[PDB]
Every structure is written in C-alpha cells, then in structure tokens.
Design a protein around this ligand. Sequence first.
Ligand SMILES: *[C@@H]1O[C@H](CO)[C@@H](O[C@@H]2O[C@H](CO)[C@@H](O[C@@H]3O[C@H](CO[C@H]4O[C@H](CO)[C@@H](O)[C@H](O)[C@@H]4O)[C@@H](O)[C@H](O[C@H]4O[C@H](CO)[C@@H](O)[C@H](O)[C@@H]4O)[C@@H]3O)[C@H](O)[C@H]2NC(C)=O)[C@H](O)[C@H]1NC(C)=O
Ligand SMILES: *[C@@H]1O[C@H](CO)[C@@H](O[C@@H]2O[C@H](CO)[C@@H](O)[C@H](O)[C@H]2NC(C)=O)[C@H](O)[C@H]1NC(C)=O
Ligand SMILES: *[C@@H]1O[C@H](CO)[C@@H](O)[C@H](O)[C@H]1NC(C)=O
Length: 870
Amino acid sequence: KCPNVLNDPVNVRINCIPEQFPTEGICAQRGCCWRPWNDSLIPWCFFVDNHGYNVQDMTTTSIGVEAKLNRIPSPTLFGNDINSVLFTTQNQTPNRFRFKITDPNNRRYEVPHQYVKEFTGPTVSDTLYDVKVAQNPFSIQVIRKSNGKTLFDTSIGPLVYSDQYLQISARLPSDYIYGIGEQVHKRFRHDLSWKTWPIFTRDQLPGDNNNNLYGHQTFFMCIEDTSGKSFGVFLMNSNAMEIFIQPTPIVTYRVTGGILDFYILLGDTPEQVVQQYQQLVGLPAMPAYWNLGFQLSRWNYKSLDVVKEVVRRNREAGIPFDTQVTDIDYMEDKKDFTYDQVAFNGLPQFVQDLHDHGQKYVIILDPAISIGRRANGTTYATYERGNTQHVWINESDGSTPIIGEVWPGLTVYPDFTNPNCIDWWANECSIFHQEVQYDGLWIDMNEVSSFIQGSTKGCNVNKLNYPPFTPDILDKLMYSKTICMDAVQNWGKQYDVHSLYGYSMAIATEQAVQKVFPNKRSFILTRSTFAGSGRHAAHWLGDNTASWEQMEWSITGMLEFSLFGIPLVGADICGFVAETTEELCRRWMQLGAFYPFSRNHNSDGYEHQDPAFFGQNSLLVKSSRQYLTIRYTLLPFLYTLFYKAHVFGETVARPVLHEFYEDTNSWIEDTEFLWGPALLITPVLKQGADTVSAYIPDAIWYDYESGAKRPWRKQRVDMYLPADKIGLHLRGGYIIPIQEPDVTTTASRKNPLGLIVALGENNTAKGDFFWDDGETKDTIQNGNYILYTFSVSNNTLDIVCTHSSYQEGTTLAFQTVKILGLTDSVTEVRVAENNQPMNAHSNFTYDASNQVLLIADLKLNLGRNFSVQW
Ligand SMILES: *[C@@H]1O[C@H](CO)[C@@H](O[C@@H]2O[C@H](CO)[C@@H](O[C@@H]3O[C@H](CO[C@H]4O[C@H](CO)[C@@H](O)[C@H](O)[C@@H]4O)[C@@H](O)[C@H](O[C@H]4O[C@H](CO)[C@@H](O)[C@H](O)[C@@H]4O)[C@@H]3O)[C@H](O)[C@H]2NC(C)=O)[C@H](O)[C@H]1NC(C)=O
Ligand SMILES: *[C@@H]1O[C@H](CO)[C@@H](O[C@@H]2O[C@H](CO)[C@@H](O)[C@H](O)[C@H]2NC(C)=O)[C@H](O)[C@H]1NC(C)=O
Ligand SMILES: *[C@@H]1O[C@H](CO)[C@@H](O)[C@H](O)[C@H]1NC(C)=O
C-alpha cells in the first residue's frame, strides 16, 4: 500500500531499502511502497504507513508514562523482530525529557555509563516541554509549550525494533542542525541533502568522506528561531549505527543493537542546550594551567639527541612552550612502560633538565601489551603481572586471551572495565614513574585498533561478526582494524561495548593519575571518545594532513567537540601526514595559537616542522612567537572560561551563533570562532591569500593589537591580513583578565596581572576572573580559590572579590589596566581601595587617536576590592 495521492511529497519518504540498491521485488517482499524517481537521492521504496507499532494499554506513573506496544504484523526487515515492546517516559527536569523503548521479556544491552545516574524521582511539575503520544500507529511528539512549536515528531515513519536492527525517525522544526561525530563534516551546519553519517569507534586517517572515525558522539543540537530557542537530541547507545539526514528535515537512526534511549533537551539559547547536555552526561574536567601551554611533539625523533636539539633550538628562538611530548620511539621496541636504553640513553636526566626550566614532559601510552620478551631476553614485567591478575580481554569462550597486533608485534588487550585492570594499570604507571618522571599521559590507539583484522586466528562466522544490517562504516566489516565482535569484556560482548573502550581507558587513566600524582590534575589526552569523556580527558582531532582543506576543517571539528562537552580540544598544528609548507605552517601556527589545546605534531619520516626549524630570524618564528605570546598573555582569561566550563558547562571555543543567534547570518558561519563571549578569531584559510571575507557580527569590535575601534558592525567585510597577521578582535562590553607573558606557564604565573576593558555602546563592561594554584584536583570543590567580578560604568571600574581562600595568590596584583574605546579625553585618574577615599594616580597615558587609556604601575592586590576612575 502507497499514499492515496499519486504525485505524493518526496521529502517525507522514509527509505525501506536503506542498505542496498532498490528493486521492485525486495520492495514487495518487505511490504513497502514501490514508486521510482528521476534521481537516486529520493527513496524508490519507502514505508508509507505499513510498518510500526500500536499502543494497547498505556498508564501514568509519577515520573511519566508507561505503554505496551505491539508490532503491526508486516513482513520482517532483517529478521528477529520483537512483537511485544515497552515504551517508558521520564520527566527528569523542567528542561530534559527522556524516553526509552525496551524488551520486557529480555534484558537487552544498555550502555553502562559511569556518570548518567538512574532516575526515580522526585516528580517535576511545570516543565517546558509537552509530550503527546499517538495511539495507532504509535508515535511520540515533544512540544515546547511556551509557544506550541513541535520539536521532535516520530509520527513521520515507523518504529522498527528487531534484535539487530533498530529504527526511529524524527521531524525537526528548522533546517539548522549541528553535531554528530566523529566524522569530517567540513561545514559546521549540516547539509540536509540526503546524507549518511556512520558512528562506530575506528582508527582511520580523517579525509574528505563520511568515514566513522575515532569517537562516538550521537548528540546533535538544533536552533528553532531568531529568539535563540533551541533543543538537543542525545541517543544513549554504543552499538554501530547510521544517522541519516534528509530534507524537511527528518533525521533517522538505524542502529545494530541495544535499546532506544533518547534524551531531549530544551534551552533558551544554544549555549543553554550545550549546558543542559553536560549537566546530564558530566561536566568537563578542569585542566591544569600548564595543559594550556604550547606543546611540541613528533612521531619518531629517532634518538634523544634529536629531541634535545629540537628543545634547545626552540628555547633559543624565544618560543613559548610548556611541554615536550615524546611518541612511541621513546620506548624499547615500542613496548609500554619501558624506554630505549640505547638511543634514548639519559632520559631521566633530560626529564630533569625539562623540570629545571619549568617545563613538562608527556609520554604516549598504548593499550596493547606485548606478549614478547624484553631486549636482553628478560621477562617483560608488565605482561607477566597482567597474566597474574587476569587483566586481559578474552575470546568468545571467556578463557583464552585474544591476540591482536599493534606497534610491538603481537599483543593482548587490557579490559579497562575490570576493576582489577584499573588497579593493574594504576600500578604500572606508578612503577614506571619511579624510573621516568613523566608529568602527563597521552593514551592513543584507544578505539581498540588492531593492525590485523579480528584476531591472530581470524573470526568465527556468526551473526555478531557478520550482522544482518551493517551501517555505512568503512570496509563495511565490523571487525576491520579492531578485534572480534564476540570477544568478552566485563561490561559485555565486543559487539555491544566496542565504542566504550576508549572511554573506559580514560576512566582507568584518571584513577592511575590519582595513584601517581596524588591530588594533582596532570594531563590525559585521549583519541577515542564516548559521550562525556570530557569529564576524564582532553581530545585532539587525530591524524590530519598538511593541507589547507584540513586546516579549514579543523575549526568546524573543534567546534563540534565544544558541543560534546570536551572543551580542551585542538588539531595537530601544521599537519601530521605529509611535509608542510613554510606558508601553510606559518598560518596554522597563527590559528593554532588559539586552539584550546595547542600542539604541533608530525608523522614519521617527514621533515621537521617545529617553529625554530624554519630559521631563527624567519618570518614564521617572528609570527609564531608573537601569537603564542598573545596566547600566554590571555591565559588567565582562557583558564577562567575553563572554570566556567567545569562549573556551569559553558563552551570555551564557541561558534559565533552561540553569541549572535539574533542574526541568521551567524547560523552558518564556521570559518571563525570565539574564545567565550569576548574574543573573535578570524584566520586565513586559503593558500596564497592576503585577504579574507569575514562576517563581523552585531557588536562593537576593537583590534586586539592596536586597540582601535573597527568601523564594522553586522556585515561582511574584506579583512586585510598580510603574511604576519591574524584577525583578533575584542567585543565591546567585556573585561578580560591578562598576565604578563613568559616562555612557560610556571614562569608566567608569578608575573603581574592586568585588565582589558573593551567599552560597549552604553559605556558598560562586565567580566570575571578565577585564580587558584592551577593543579590541585579539588580546589573548586573545597573553596580554595580567588573569584573576581569586574564592572565598568560612569567611567569607573569596580574590582570586587567575591571569594578569597588561596594565600599564595595574594602575592599577585593587577598592575596595569588598559581601556579601549573612550568617548571623552582623560585628565585625572583616581584609585581607591575598599571604600576609603580616592587618591590621585600619576602613571597613565591617554591616546586620543585610538581613544585608548592605559593605566600603568598599580598595586591592586588579589584578595581585596578596588575602584578606578578616569
Ligand atoms: C551613572 O550616571 C548616571 C548619571 O546620568 C546616573 O543615572 C542617573 O540617576 C539619577 C538619580 O541618581 C537620575 O535622576 C533622576 O531621574 C528621574 C527619572 O527617573 C527614571 O528614569 C531614569 C532615566 O531613565 C532612571 O535612571 C531612573 O531609575 C528612573 O527609572 C527624574 O524624574 C528625577 O528628577 C526629579 O527632579 C526633577 C527636577 O529636578 C523633577 O522633575 C522630578 O519630579 C524628580 O523629582 C532625577 O533627575 C538620572 O535620570 C539618571 N541618569 C540618566 C540620564 O539616566 C547613575 O546613577 C550613574 N551610576 C551610578 C550607580 O552611580
Ligand atoms: C578471562 O579469563 C580469565 C582467565 O581465564 C578470567 O580470570 C578469572 O578471574 C577471577 C577474578 O580475577 C579469578 O579469581 C580467577 O582466577 C580467574 N580464572 C581463571 C581460571 O584463571 C577472567 O575473568 C576472564 N575475563 C573476562 C572478562 O571474560
Ligand atoms: C522529476 O520528475 C518530476 C515529476 O514527474 C518533474 O516535475 C521533475 O522536473 C523531474 N526532474 C527532471 C530532472 O526532469
């Protein structure tokens, strides 16, 4: 059966043959409607209303609604349907609604999240949403009651619930969708034109395609209208899946196992929706201050002598960099928890030299543990202890450990979901730290990557390894570049918990960090990610390529991870794969200075690409130094945004639409971004370019370098950015805290502080500032910090300390206040502490050309309150 109207509307057709080229026979065989088309974007075979479920009996509970569902008895799709299914609603908060669909007569796999708590009460009354549930056929419908706009409309297609194929579709109210990962999107706002996005954790070079990559994030967000009203949709399921987007727009989930567990999250602004999502899934970890310093790295330095030569040439070029990373070449025959005693002879002395300069040292750690013997024939202690404690992932029998292959040849895999394994791991890092004093860890190969397909002895041929429906994952082969789908772990079968491996290792390393650096924050950088891995680790965008495309795409990739609540994120500056250009790398170093996580990294064999390799008096070194210096100056501001992220769930690097949603031009913009609300970063992203077409939003902007008020507002301009400049603007209405830069955060942190006041329209400005020791894990939780509020109006600045419980912070002071965009010239400056009367201040400069005032040599000590008048 087909729609009564002959020339029906095509954008509402839900594809009935999603895995294969449509044929009339298979269409009929599935009981769907056959009606071919001029192109092959539009489905030729679609369920009109032929598949689905009906409600028979539904009741009310205190929390929401239970409903028993029965399969409308159409033919099967991929077999093993479940005829009798249970729908459950939970009105969790006034802002988030949750529904789930389960098998009453069997406990199906449910993601064993480590933060998402079970909900039972209390009952929330007066919610912002409204849930209508159609009866025949079943469909859910979520409505914003405020204005009656319907957000999530299941009525548009069937529910298909079979043992290995799950399908539900939803009509959305606008054409603006953001998120889903990890893939290369290229553009921040989604193309709606019939696109599949496969999600399944996987080791793969990011390129121009829809391949599933390192992380598994199902969250997407959507802006309803010009008032900023938005919502988000998160599906809690870790099986392989496709998310399909088509015009109207109707998004469709096709998933290979588990249950359907949806959360729908309302907000007043896009910023609020992202906050709501992090509330549910976990707020991001607060980083250590030194995490924000610049990092140098490469795969295969070959020897400690080359590492040394790189460090000293960069120190000499005056490049600010806090940390030195060291890839698998530091290890002995690429074995975890060892170091090459020959080519990396003298490592602990070198580590000592780093610490002597106030620098830090990060090592890579892979999950795979070698079955082999050490160099001089001795038993490999890590492997031996692993056996003793039975730490490994077993084959389908549940006894024999599975054998893959990674860097050191054949290997076994730790089951980081085992509480014994987390102990073993923590122990290994503790033992190793006594030999080599690392400062932080970088966990790689997280996806569970294997160089061989499946296992050392291949895969058993079954429904788990060769499922009835495979989504568009690379190679269309589940066990490709990973382990057998029937492998057993403590949380479950590989088929179910595959995408959770990287997640669990981040958790395991967060414990390991507490054993090694008691009560410190350290550093954990992870590759694979699941929902709310922000809570445990930092992420970088993987193995990119020295390529202008790839540099452009990193912005929209970084902004997506901001949505996913992993704020400490960056790409590999200058390009991992391939040799980089002087020109490309000069530009990427400018942009890279403004990634939340800022690190230059390179692949094996290609020429060096660290800044100082391009020449001590090179334009690249001059530029990089200048902008890394700007970065370091702004670190107090950045760090404060990270505090706000950790506490309220705000974004650090945010897209322009988050602040300027009243303008529909901001909705599509993704070639520039912001640090929080105040700083606008506009990079050069085309080869050879001298100029860039930039959309400058609806506010007052000041050039960061000069301080001059730009004559631009709510318009597109041709911004002139020569070989050494990158667009930096401060937004009027904001006060940002800065601190005199140095070449390490260690050194910079004891330097005098300062404020920048970008005045805005009504001659107002607001700002905040958070300061602690930047490393102790529980400072926020124990009230051991300083917190400030800034306020300007009537040509007078108020510095208000709202909390003060950190003694070593009292020694620092704001000693410099720069005020941009003055309406009238200045004669006298007066300064008062607390509420004492104001004395005159001599040291100041007024520049009538730029309307800039800079007040020098003050002594506004952290801890106390002050006023400054001009
Ligand atoms: C930053 O700088 C400005 C200085 O301009 C200060 O704001 C002014 O505040 C004063 C009082 O401190 C205001 O003066 C009074 O305004 C009344 C109008 O009140 C409403 O509207 C104003 C402006 O929109 C609001 O600010 C205010 O809250 C009210 O909502 C007048 O009616 C008053 O006049 C009285 O006397 C006249 C005769 O002289 C009679 O006609 C009336 O009956 C009445 O009795 C008075 O003028 C002033 O309006 C504000 N300025 C402006 C232009 O907005 C801020 O105080 C300062 N910031 C700080 C915190 O110091
Ligand atoms: C994989 O197999 C190992 C060994 O075959 C299992 O280890 C058992 O673990 C418990 C608790 O650590 C011990 O008391 C037993 O000594 C172990 N059994 C034996 C016979 O060695 C392990 O549980 C299996 N792992 C998973 C998750 O399947
Ligand atoms: C496709 O078919 C429709 C309906 O018959 C028609 O209106 C449309 O123009 C066709 N497209 C092309 C490319 O001819």
